[PDB]
UniProtKB/Swiss-Prot annotation:
Optimum temperature is 20-25 degrees Celsius. Belongs to the iron/ascorbate-dependent oxidoreductase family. It comes from Pseudomonas savastanoi pv. phaseolicola. It catalyses: 2-oxoglutarate + O2 + 2 H(+) = ethene + 3 CO2 + H2O; L-arginine + 2-oxoglutarate + O2 = guanidine + L-glutamate 5-semialdehyde + succinate + CO2. Optimum pH is 7.0-7.5. InterPro entries: DIOX_N, IPNS-like_FE2OG_OXY, IPNS-like_sf, Iron_ascorbate_oxido_reductase, Oxoglu/Fe-dep_dioxygenase_dom. This is 2-oxoglutarate-dependent ethylene/succinate-forming enzyme. Simultaneously catalyzes two reactions, namely formation of ethylene and of succinate from 2-oxoglutarate, with a molar ratio of 2:1. PROSITE patterns: FE2OG_OXY. One of its GO terms (molecular function) is 2-oxoglutarate oxygenase/decarboxylase (ethylene-forming) activity. Pathway: Alkene biosynthesis; ethylene biosynthesis via 2-oxoglutarate. A dual-circuit mechanism has been proposed in PubMed:1445291 for the complete reaction, in which the binding of L-arginine and 2-oxoglutarate in a Schiff-base structure generates a common intermediate for the two reactions. Gene3D superfamilies: B-lactam Antibiotic, Isopenicillin N Synthase, Chain (2.60.120.330). It is an enzyme of class 1 (oxidoreductase).
Length: 342
């Protein structure tokens, strides 16, 4: 396949042998030079990817009245209309179904009113099964990647996985419309918020990523005064992520940039509308909602990122008018975050 990125195959199990350490070095190097790489999918990884894309296509054909009903005031899971999300003050144009951790009202965290905790408003049970199976496979890959990354930095194999038990993994199931006006913006420039972003796309094309740039200051999106949203949109360089069959892409999120002190950067990226609609799934391999990330290479440093606080801050800014956000504000659910930080 004519591709524009490096492609690696992951071992099923990462044990810490010499081959694993070598692979970790290569993944770190690819992120440091290109900001991204591809991982080869096996037949089951690919099958589950395609079944998820098919379920997304069927869901998006449903009437807006139905899609709009798939929302929750407890969790951000569920439907986002085209034009609803905001990035740096401007609307984004995909329709989205967000899948966060699927917690019923029987869950203790939901009973306690923790922000963002609640059940996915699945459109139907076939969609549910397809997305759950796909996300379980994506999670296995995320864990492999985190073990390899630790090994490549000469850290204990468990360094990042010790933050991801019951991790706050989630996924955006996206359909981008074709460009119809002179507007070609799909999503504005941004970074995502956790450890890794693992993504799949169809054959259409539209994702651009920004590699590391020597001498370029990068905002630390975990700080309220350094948002990465809306940065570098029109400025070179941007790498086109050529659609390639049988791969997922992988790039760092904000937590990986923080923990590595910028040795890895949270990859800025944006989406442009193409002449045809475009289906994609972006998966976020995240710390536990309660985990506090810390700098690995600066053990004098007292700075921390409480991951759940970062997620909640980000989703409130994405969806300022959503019923989920309104209920966080109404019930003072951010107070739970203050207690957890103790
Ligand atoms: N929920 C997301 N991950 N959204 C990604 C797009 C950027 C997001 N709207 C922001 O302002 O940070
Ligand atoms: Mn993104």
């Amino acid at each position: 396949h004519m591709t524009n990125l490096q492609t690696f195959e992951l071992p099923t199990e990462v044990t810490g042998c010499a081959a694993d350490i070598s692979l970790g070095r290569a993944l770190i190097q690819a992120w440091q030079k290109d900001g991204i790489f591809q991982i080869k999918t096996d037949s089951e990884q690919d099958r589950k990817t395609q079944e998820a894309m098919a379920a997304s296509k069927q869901f998006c054909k449903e009437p807006l009245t139905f899609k709009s009903s798939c929302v929750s005031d407890l969790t951000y899971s569920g439907y986002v209309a085209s034009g609803e999300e905001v990035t740096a003050g401007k609307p984004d144009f995909p329709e989205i179904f967000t899948v966060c951790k699927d917690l019923s009202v029987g869950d203790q965290r939901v009973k306690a009113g923790w922000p963002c905790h609640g059940p996915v408003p699945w459109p139907n049970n076939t969609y549910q099964k397809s997305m759950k199976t796909f996300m379980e496979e994506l999670g296995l890959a995320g864990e492999r990647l985190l073990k390899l990354t630790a090994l490549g930095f000469e850290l204990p194999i468990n360094t990042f996985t010790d933050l991801t038990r019951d991790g706050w993994h989630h996924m955006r199931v996206l359909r981008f419309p074709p460009q119809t006006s002179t507007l070609s913006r799909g999503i504005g420039a941004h970074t995502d918020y956790g450890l890794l972003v693992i993504a799949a796309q169809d054959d259409v094309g539209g994702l651009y990523i920004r590699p590391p740039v020597e001498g370029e200051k990068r905002n630390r999106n975990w700080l309220p005064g350094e948002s990465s949203a809306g940065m570098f949109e029109h400025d070179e360089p941007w790498t086109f992520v050529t659609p390639t069959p049988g791969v997922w892409t992988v790039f760092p999120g904000d937590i990986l940039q923080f923990m590595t002190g910028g040795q890895l950067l949270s990859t800025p990226h944006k989406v442009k509308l193409n002449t045809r609609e475009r289906f994609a799934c972006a998966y976020f391999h995240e710390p536990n909602f309660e985990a506090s990330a810390y700098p690995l290479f600066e053990p004098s440093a007292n700075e921390r990122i409480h991951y759940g606080e970062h997620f909640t801050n980000m989703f409130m800014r994405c969806y300022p008018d959503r019923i989920t956000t309104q209920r966080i504000n109404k019930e003072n659910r951010l107070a739970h975050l203050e207690d957890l930080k103790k």
